[PDB]
Design an enzyme around this catalytic site. Structure first.
Site, PDB file in Angstrom:
ATOM      1  N   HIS B  47       0.818  -1.218   0.000  1.00 33.75           N
ATOM      2  CA  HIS B  47       0.000   0.000   0.000  1.00 33.75           C
ATOM      3  C   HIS B  47       0.850   1.265   0.000  1.00 33.75           C
ATOM      4  O   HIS B  47       0.374   2.345  -0.349  1.00 33.75           O
ATOM      5  CB  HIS B  47      -0.948   0.020   1.202  1.00 33.75           C
ATOM      6  CG  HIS B  47      -0.267   0.274   2.513  1.00 33.75           C
ATOM      7  ND1 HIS B  47       0.141  -0.744   3.349  1.00 33.75           N
ATOM      8  CD2 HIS B  47       0.064   1.430   3.135  1.00 33.75           C
ATOM      9  CE1 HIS B  47       0.702  -0.225   4.428  1.00 33.75           C
ATOM     10  NE2 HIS B  47       0.669   1.090   4.322  1.00 33.75           N
ATOM     11  N   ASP B  77       0.017  -7.901   1.878  1.00 30.54           N
ATOM     12  CA  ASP B  77       0.356  -6.482   1.796  1.00 30.54           C
ATOM     13  C   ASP B  77       1.877  -6.252   1.782  1.00 30.54           C
ATOM     14  O   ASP B  77       2.368  -5.309   2.384  1.00 30.54           O
ATOM     15  CB  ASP B  77      -0.278  -5.721   2.970  1.00 30.54           C
ATOM     16  CG  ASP B  77      -0.122  -4.214   2.847  1.00 30.54           C
ATOM     17  OD1 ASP B  77      -0.179  -3.703   1.710  1.00 30.54           O
ATOM     18  OD2 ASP B  77       0.076  -3.544   3.883  1.00 30.54           O
ATOM     19  N   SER B 149       4.897   1.647   9.367  1.00 27.41           N
ATOM     20  CA  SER B 149       4.338   0.647   8.468  1.00 27.41           C
ATOM     21  C   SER B 149       5.358   0.254   7.402  1.00 27.41           C
ATOM     22  O   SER B 149       5.939   1.112   6.730  1.00 27.41           O
ATOM     23  CB  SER B 149       3.063   1.161   7.810  1.00 27.41           C
ATOM     24  OG  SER B 149       2.406   0.116   7.115  1.00 27.41           O
TER      25      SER B 149
END
Ligand code: NI
Lengths: 282, 268, 277
Positions: B47, B77, B149
């Protein structure tokens, strides 16, 4: 076996962390003293000097300090600093005071365990680590260069102490975004306090120059600034400041901050030597 | 006495965690990544790098690199990047034999600059290729935000536990064993190829996917699968992980003896 | 070297933390702690409230139907019992362990499976039976949510510090108090608290109307030097003593020197205690 515990740090440190009350006389219609704001503070030494947050004591008509041992004192405001959100208080104590453990030679490291101590719910302790050590220099760079920690920092412990597992002061908690708190590094907090005690305010030197090293390339020059008046221009390269080789922008602006206003210093740039008159920060 | 500290883990792991800049020329999105090895491979979140016209990587030592996109996987992801390794790279410490345990201390490493937070492993999660959803990822109470992240989850030795990915208090990470497998498959095929038998639910079959391998092989609902591909099926979750490892096009017997050919997992 | 880990605490404790299912469909979910081999389980009152059937699920897969023994509003505690002849995992309990501020604790609760979070004791709280409100529970920065509510708070040895009960400040009933409450719920089906009707020798600030003190002849501003043949040094400790006294009991109260015979009564039922008022 012995349960894992930080209780040693708590017993050593916690008695030096106090409640701080901001009371106004205009707060209610009857002009009776009433709490506007609450917070925490840290007793630095036996003279009764206490560090807290500036936002805790702002516009206080009366400041009250309450120790964990039950004693209550009225406090005088020594001075405050908006850039660090620090303030210094003084109480007049008879009979001695608890004081926060400090080791001036201790080098904080990213990953060090820390306890945040603050004093409705009584004295609270939360645990975390040092996320970032921050900078101890006087040049304000913003919050990113404060000490960061994942120990919960809330309105309850703001102005309170951040200590390591030995109970040694790491910094002063300051409320200011996602699961991350900030503190003023103790080395800076101490400098600010000594300056506030002496001058009643923090006097910073200001050269009015932006830039980043690849010498140090000047990106911008503040209008009506010391640099502008000296003849410094954009794109100029400063290889020396006050007879100190400049390898770093952040390091150099810290040096300027220590320089007392009114001081004239040589600034070497490529080779023109300019005489700059340092001025007080805005 | 010395202060209690995880700085050891920081010193070892942190240099290997990089900033990732997605540019579409301005910066659209930011994130973190982990340098895996001296070949220059980096794992980050999908992402983060979605719809990137250019991807840039910045190391803690100041070096900046343009990065190649090797591939990505929606289900985990994850995405793999590659950068020039010439001058030599800091790499994340990894121990393939290290068994993560619930209760293990972990540091999440990944705006405000490099940020390190501490927590424990709440749940270890599954390392298999069959997508189970986020519930089977590693869970930690070390704060997980946009800032970290795609960054590293490490133990007190600095060894990589997982890759951080985005109640409110629980963060998730891909277990390092699974991240390693995903990365190798992306390097080989440019994408993650998964074996798919199309069966839900010896093992009692709850449902059979339409026009699926199982349906075509003659498997019917309520049937009991006692073996798959010369393996006993004790567990559903573990059986589906085996199916995922099987290459599409391969014919295996399903004892319930039916012959089924594997199909590639649906792409979405 | 070896990685820093609390896994030891996890292996000892976690098996004893169970899922609790309130059904009326499932109205509510929660966690619970198996206290002993007999099969008594502690959970939260708000979890099991208005439950037609209560079900308990162990991590090892076993499932039991639970009997509701009783509950206590003030501590938000309830006790369940299950019959298990196959033996049960029990939570480690050390009754001589003194919890300290700064002790490392794990919060264990049993969606997304069993969850374990780590923190410290921020404040120890009080173990007395007389209700003081939330301020006096154990406080911890270990995350306390709907997931782990009713679950266990344990130290790094896996010993029970408290029972989780619902900013970044979590609360738990101290294990010493949780044990006292459980034993009382088991015997009486409810917590029976002794009540003297007095506000805090000890200077009396107030005397409750139609209360035990009022009827005995005790007046406001009086000084209580003794209660039930025990010195009264402290108000909080004295009200804890009264709380342990069975209702209907007649005790002497020395005040300066008049000796008064007081008939203790049940704590007047108050659902209003935690309400601000
Ligand atoms: Ni009410």
């Amino acid at each position: 076996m012995t349960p894992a515990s930080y209780n040693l740090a708590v017993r050593r440190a916690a008695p030096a962390v106090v409640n701080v009350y901001n009371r106004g006389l205009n707060t209610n219609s009857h002009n009776q003293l009433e709490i506007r704001t609450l917070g925490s503070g840290v007793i630095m030494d036996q003279r009764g000097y206490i560090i807290t947050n500036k936002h805790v004591i702002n516009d206080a008509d009366q400041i009250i300090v309450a120790l964990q041992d039950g004693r209550v004192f009225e406090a005088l405001l020594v001075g405050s600093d908006s850039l660090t959100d620090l303030a210094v208080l003084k109480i007049n104590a008879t009979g001695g005071l608890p004081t926060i453990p400090i080791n001036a030679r201790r080098v904080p490291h990213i990953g060090d365990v820390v306890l945040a101590i603050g004093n409705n719910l009584g004295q609270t302790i939360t645990q975390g680590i040092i996320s970032a050590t921050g900078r101890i220099g006087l040049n304000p760079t913003g919050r990113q260069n404060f000490l960061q920690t994942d120990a919960s920092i809330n309105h309850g412990n703001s102005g309170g102490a951040l200590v390591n597992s030995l109970g040694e002061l790491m910094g002063i908690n300051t409320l200011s975004p996602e699961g991350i708190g900030f503190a003023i590094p103790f080395q800076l907090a101490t400098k600010i306090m000594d300056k506030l005690i002496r001058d009643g305010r923090v006097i910073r030197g200001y050269i009015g120059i932006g830039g980043r090293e690849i010498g140090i390339v000047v990106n911008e020059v503040s209008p009506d600034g010391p640099a502008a008046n000296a003849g410094i221009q954009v794109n100029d390269l400063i290889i020396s400041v006050d007879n100190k080789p400049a390898i770093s922008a952040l390091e150099t602006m810290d040096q300027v901050a220590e320089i007392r206003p009114g001081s004239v210093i040589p600034v070497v740039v490529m080779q023109l030597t300019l005489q700059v008159t340092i001025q007080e920060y805005p």
